[PDB]
Design an enzyme around this catalytic site. Structure first.
Site, short mmCIF file in Angstrom:
data_model
loop_
_atom_site.label_atom_id
_atom_site.label_comp_id
_atom_site.label_asym_id
_atom_site.label_seq_id
_atom_site.Cartn_x
_atom_site.Cartn_y
_atom_site.Cartn_z
N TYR B 70 24.10 54.89 42.10
CA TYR B 70 25.41 55.22 42.35
C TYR B 70 25.56 55.11 43.90
CZ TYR B 70 29.64 56.30 40.36
OH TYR B 70 31.15 56.28 40.13
N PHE B 122 50.09 34.57 49.80
CA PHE B 122 49.40 34.34 48.46
C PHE B 122 50.10 35.54 47.47
CE2 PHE B 122 45.99 35.17 45.08
CZ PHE B 122 45.90 33.85 44.88
N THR B 123 50.06 34.99 46.16
CA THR B 123 50.98 36.01 45.40
C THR B 123 50.31 37.54 45.41
OG1 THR B 123 49.56 35.04 43.57
CG2 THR B 123 51.95 34.52 43.67
N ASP B 213 43.21 37.20 55.68
CA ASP B 213 43.21 36.84 54.35
C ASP B 213 41.89 35.82 54.36
OD1 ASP B 213 43.03 35.76 51.64
OD2 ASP B 213 44.89 35.88 51.37
N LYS B 256 35.53 32.87 46.12
CA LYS B 256 35.67 31.78 46.82
C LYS B 256 34.44 31.38 47.60
CE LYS B 256 39.93 32.53 44.82
NZ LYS B 256 41.10 32.95 45.70
N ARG B 380 51.29 24.29 38.47
CA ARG B 380 51.97 25.18 39.64
C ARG B 380 53.32 24.88 39.84
NH1 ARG B 380 49.42 30.01 40.13
NH2 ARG B 380 50.10 29.70 38.05
N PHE B 447 53.68 31.54 32.42
CA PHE B 447 52.64 30.39 32.47
C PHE B 447 51.49 30.71 31.77
CE2 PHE B 447 49.66 32.42 35.18
CZ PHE B 447 50.29 33.47 35.73
#
Ligand SMILES: [K+]
Ligand SMILES: [K+]
Ligand SMILES: [K+]
Ligand SMILES: [K+]
Lengths: 455, 455, 455, 455
Positions: B70, B122-123, B213, B256, B380, B447
């Site tokens: 932990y 970005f969303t 980001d 990523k 998209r 979507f």
């Protein structure tokens, strides 16, 4: 009284076995705070039962079959159908662990100013309730707050209190009942099926929703099979399914009773809440098809939840924790009673009556345990309670405890003897344990990084 | 031009290889929505470049050495040292993936009504900014919005727009600058070191913070290495370290450029913000010592970020994507230009000029691509854009695209040929592609679960 | 007295936990032959201590880094360095397990008609010697043959018998001395360093080679450490290295003391013999650079041999076996004494004194033990001895035993209690155990597939 | 002409990518012998197609489910029933790899002085035949010995030759026919079903047994499906099963067509031979229930053999090797024809006509290939042939080749281009390749450790 492990050892985790004098140095380097110790320096780590479980060979085979697709993963399908079968809810949204599911539920189910009533509380669960504008109301039976009282199903809700909240506040002003199994803050105390049924019956009559905090629901199911009359011919699976039949949904941590090192999920029956849940999960966790988990982890959690249904496994789990408690109690060591499903809590106040709470007996007892045995335990007392930011005084909790928290399938009865024997030996010269004073104190989360020295 | 894979195949993921007629039945069962296809029915899955990366043997060795403690896990310490070494920040807080880091950053760094300005958006990133009271301002160069314009470093911030914002709004009213590398919305466009330096110099003069980001920072470093004068004798690692030297911290998705299937983290230099971040992480993610990750994933991410520094690996990563774009462009297929680091975007408006946007050309083109090749791609366009709640009209986006998103180390040039040859054959008879109409439309997140039929 | 496990459980092997009545049906389907039981039907499998060991997390990490190259594998180089460091031999040739090394040694080192003398013998080891024209001579001390005699270092060679052989046969007529550590046939009895030194000194004076059958050399090193004066300040590694300093080479099974599931090797100092061994390994095992092993297994064996050097690990290994023997002896159950390193042997002749050897007391006792506890044990008596081809009479061995053979790091003391308590309960009503008779007898290898019924 | 990989990459094996000047140093340190190169220094390792295959995710899941019991393992049961289903033989005995099965078969099936006739030979296979007293007779068709002749099913037995052996020696003096699929020494050439049938029919009439050397039987089955009339509607599985229906048993290496890194087995129909096989396996390999393999490896081999039956997998396997051959032939590079199932063989004699065989053109070509590309290949020429120990002269083989041997599922077409492009480039200045001379020569196995320098 105590069954052998209903499994074999497949692989082991190597440990250093450093001796006492070396442990004393590590403890000092950690400023006498067990939270600052390095894992590599610890023989038996009882800091938590969360996320440190030993997985099986079948789960590890699942780990090699991770289907890491963003949507339509075979692992998501397996988790979904496993949870539908075993818990009986219509819809499942995965989350990375339990508090991710709590974040979603509280945002979906509470209007500002409403009450959430529950059988005591857990830190993250209650934070998310209040962050969203709920007022928390404790409706556990009065006995649960008496740490020495040995009664069965000590986690039960007091139906009279539920009735009074309804009478005084009005049903439309209660967001939901949050019923936890087991009840962590009382030491891991179970809740009876009779109680879950009666709570469902009274809330349904008033149109009030019930959501479980279900993290140790399998431990709970075991106490029902063992101690509730009428459940002796029922399987663990049957008990788990009936339990959840009395709820509108749940928040679950796989890291506790699903036998995994990461994972959780949110369940519900209502379609509109499911739709809303899917739009919100995207923001905080990920798509509804993975919810902040690798595909391999959805697979491991699906396999682990099913393994947890095996009677012999959960019987041994609970009786192993019981063995530790029985051995401590037999030597006169003061503990929270009855022993719960996942941990034994030492009463450090009673253990060290020669010390004041301001000398931090729980923090110091935890230090002593590590030095003498190589075992790490957690401070759950005055230090963890924090300081009053208005007055500058300690919050002084009634409970001044050291938690010996037991990961699933990791340790043996011989490890339990290492723990008990060392605590018993310390207890025979309990007066030698020294008080602690802060030498460094953070303004916040002080239990995590505070450092001390002996008075 | 196109290098061979700088690695060997250690293990394979088996696929079914179902033929055209059987794919057509699967497409019909999915309502012509590729988001509804089962992973087990797909040969080449280009739905996302997030979290589907192939790990190495060394990362898999690390997966077997998960220290699931932990606090004090060896895996935490390894992640922490690695990110300190390679990114150059003082403090690191793990999160389960990138949007978990964004949630923490936006809560810590924004006062209601302040502005957050960036190179497009970005969303999840912009949602977390807006949810905390920020107003978003786009400060990307105008050229970035011209999808057909072939220019280098198309992701660059316009220093003149940044300057105008400061003059018109006041430095104290800007929460921070959110500089993204690469820029996803423009097709994965890189930002130059010269731009990163100019932005740091201007913001610093006014006391404004910059947070990156950083999800595709390594792909970005490759473009700088390849195309920015002065960087020819620099390693990828030297370029990455200099990039982050111009920021106050970052949000990162391991899913990523760190070559893992789950994981992210938050970095900052400021001691006070670090203390606050630790308080907040406990309620959303987990303790600061694991942040909603298994120890084995902290380990796999530490190892994978270091592997990403290998010149031959990232050169190949980016040139594989380029191969696909070059082959499509040479056949006259309309794409977003120049090709970015991680994906190729088809201009479905231009591809299906015989259809109106109301007939869903991107959704239909992605369906055709699956039927003809077994390749999954992401809509998209107008479907993902959603419907206006207020008016009930479609949001009609300028970008009507199909995204061919490429996981790292999973596919070969032969797989890229399957993708390209099928698209090129479809292009040659593009007039024959049929429009779609809804047969089922969700109110939210349409979507993900909408179903269609041909007009 | 009995230390706790010096490791944690990393992963588990799931078992069925079938009850007594269902075990009786499985025993009947197996014709009361434990060799015929399915592994999936067994709780605790003590059939062998060969190749069933639990590997560590570090060994599992190495399993993911298999370099499967035909020559020049990193895993080969790691095995080679490790064995050179710890055993002190010049040259190493991997083999798939120990008997593969024996085949090579006996072909290289024996001229037809020469003698090979050792401290008792093992089946494969002596077969390979005899197949190549050697005559076996037993030079163990007479005491070793008295199964009830409690003395230390019972495995020691009688220097007087070794001396007699040299005098009566001539040094040139002795191929080599095969010194085994520990001695399996006497119950796993250790050999003292003083004995190893005296044998080296005598053989060297006559130019005779010594090769160790080394499969349990680490268990042997533990006994020396515990019981031989002068070795109290020495590490297990120092003791192992000195042991092998008194040999010309060895045959090793990794499946025993190197903590793996497959693997072995041949060591020698002589350059000429090494060249010949490389020619022969190619036809039976594989190239000298892998010797019939996957690269990952060379790696797991290199790592496991080093783990075997940890004092706490081997102390616990040997004391766990001792716990089982002590508990049985205290109840009056007849066993081979003193308890050896790896197993406890029940004297079935004495246990079932009411039966004749013709009624197969060891075979029947092993059957009862399975039925009553779910524990599998091995018949090592009249059945395994075989029938005389020439006369058609049973070979009637002095040792009529049931072997309780203990895999390393797989079981707990609680499992040892399941084994002991079931045997002790059977002993208390030993008169009730029934004799067996053949219903099916193979002409060869009868112990593997013979079937029986009760008389 | 060339299908894409019918699978995705699940995990990768990291490579160093060292440049030419560094490779030249490694090659020199290896005394210009590719057999002495370290695996860690090699980009593409085409030394062998044995045991270097990439396993699937499903095989790796199997690897986690190893049931390591000495007898009755679930993994042994799975292998046994898989081989019974797919090959159609009554009995299976596992062995650690193919040459372990050869050792058993030759000891069981040959009387001293008998003949074994086959379609050419393999080194280990023929050694075990002769060691047991057989005289080898080559009965392959004459064309197979002409390396440039492009004919189908070049591995076929010449029925007339079989007839003459029968006529001249007598059927009772022929131990068995050893029919190999494919035929390795002719370059991996397939055998037709028509031929396997005719051989069965003629031997059966005379009471003569037939055993296959089956290591590349799936590659063979693919050539039958592609090129033998009547087999176009048959599955690979159907072809494999009919193939084996014409045999009395086989020796199999899992390391070739079963897609594993270790493993093999012996099959037979005869009960008495099975009984004899079980008594002999114990001596050399292990019990008949594991045969010198870990349980996890019996599992991987059972899963891999079944994966090999997938049409697209074996089509791509063979066509990938074909691509390399086609590209070399198109550039005028001299190779053995037609290209076989598992490798391309360069004709080094023709490649380097400016050199004499005594200047070791194959050894030198292999050196040149590694230096220019990072690719390792095997010398199969004058060096490997060895020296005549009576006369002191080289054995001078007709074939002076460099083998580019292709592991299954490890490499891409881009790796094939690295290989071909480099060889083609070398071929354009073929005259620059220098002769080699010994600077160190072992008396035996000289190809393995000999060292050279340029003349
Ligand atoms: K964990
Ligand atoms: K993933
Ligand atoms: K084994
Ligand atoms: K191998």
């Amino acid at each position: 009284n105590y069954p052998a492990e209903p499994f074999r050892i497949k692989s082991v985790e190597t440990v250093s076995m450093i001796p006492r004098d070396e442990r004393l140095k590590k403890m000092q380097e950690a400023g006498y705070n067990t939270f600052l110790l390095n894992s590599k320096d610890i023989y038996i780590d009882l800091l938590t039962d969360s996320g440190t479980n030993a997985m099986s060979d079948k789960q590890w085979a699942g780990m090699m079959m991770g289907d890491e697709a963003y949507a339509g993963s075979e692992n998501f399908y397996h988790l979904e159908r496993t949870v539908q079968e075993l818990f009986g809810f219509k819809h499942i949204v995965p989350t990375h662990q339990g508090r991710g599911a709590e974040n979603l539920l509280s945002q979906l189910a509470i209007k500002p100013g409403q009450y959430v009533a529950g059988n005591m509380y857990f830190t993250t669960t209650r934070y998310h309730q209040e962050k969203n504008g709920a007022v928390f109301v404790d409706i556990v039976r009065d006995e649960a707050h008496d740490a020495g009282l040995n009664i069965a199903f000590k986690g039960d809700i007091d139906l009279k209190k539920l009735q009074k909240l309804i009478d005084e506040k009005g049903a439309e002003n209660i967001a939901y009942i949050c019923l936890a199994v087991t009840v962590n803050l009382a030491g891991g105390q179970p809740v009876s099926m009779a109680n879950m049924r009666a709570v469902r019956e009274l809330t349904e009559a008033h149109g009030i929703k019930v959501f479980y905090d279900a993290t140790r629901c399998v431990e709970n199911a075991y106490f029902i099979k063992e101690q509730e009359q009428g459940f002796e011919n029922k399987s663990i699976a049957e008990i788990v399914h009936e339990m959840f039949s009395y709820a509108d949904g749940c928040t679950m941590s796989g890291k506790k009773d699903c036998l995994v090192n990461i994972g959780g999920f949110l369940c519900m029956n209502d379609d509109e809440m499911f739709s809303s849940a899917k739009e919100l999960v995207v923001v905080y966790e990920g798509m509804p098809s993975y919810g902040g988990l690798a595909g391999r982890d959805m697979e491991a959690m699906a396999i682990g939840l099913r393994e947890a249904m095996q009677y012999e496994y959960i019987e041994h789990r609970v009786k192993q924790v019981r063995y530790l408690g029985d051995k401590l109690k037999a030597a006169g060591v003061p503990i929270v009673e009855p022993v719960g499903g996942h941990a034994v809590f030492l009463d450090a106040r009673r253990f060290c009556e020669h010390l004041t709470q301001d000398e931090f007996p729980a923090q110091s007892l935890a230090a002593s345990i590590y030095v003498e045995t190589g075992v790490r335990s957690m401070e759950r007392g005055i230090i963890s309670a924090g300081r009053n930011n208005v007055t500058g005084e300690h919050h002084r909790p009634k409970l001044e405890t050291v938690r010996l928290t037991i990961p699933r399938r990791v340790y043996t009865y011989a490890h339990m003897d290492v723990v008990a024997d060392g605590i018993i030996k310390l207890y025979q010269h309990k007066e030698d344990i020294r008080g602690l004073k802060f030498i460094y104190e953070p303004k916040q989360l002080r239990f995590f990084t505070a450092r001390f020295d002996y008075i």
